[PDB]
Design a binder for this molecule. Structure first.
Ligand code: PGP
Length: 103
């Protein structure tokens, strides 16, 4: 696993595929789903990402398919304005409604 979000195993290609879809919607000024993804990720957690902000979050699914406006699940891909990967985060293993980084 390139990224492990709890029990979910993601390859660098799974991440790139998810990021490409979120980035396209972001550039178009459109959102999908009840929680309006992609949307700004403020970094309340204070992760030390090595790429510049603003950051946007988009769901990454354990099933392998691109988020299509339904349930977002626990996992997210975080990218910036230049389509650079900031990180992969999850609610799994975090307290409250916070996120932890996938390893
Ligand atoms: N845990 C966490 N959730 C975030 C972060 N940024 C955005 N979110 C979630 O996305 C929601 C919508 O994002 P937005 O703020 O960019 O519009 C936020 O709602 P709240 O505004 O109630 O915090 C929050 O629940 C962040 O840095 N950490």
């Amino acid at each position: 696993c390139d990224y492990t979000c709890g029990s979910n195993c993601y390859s660098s290609s799974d991440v790139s595929t998810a990021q490409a879809a979120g980035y396209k919607l972001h550039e178009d000024g459109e959102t999908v789903g009840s929680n309006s993804y992609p949307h700004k990720y403020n970094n309340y957690e204070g992760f030390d990402f090595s790429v510049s902000s603003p950051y946007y979050e988009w769901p990454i699914l354990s099933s392998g398919d691109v988020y299509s406006g339904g349930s977002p699940g626990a996992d997210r891909v975080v990218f910036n304005e230049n389509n650079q990967l900031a990180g992969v985060i999850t609610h799994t293993g975090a307290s409250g409604n916070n996120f932890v980084e996938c390893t």
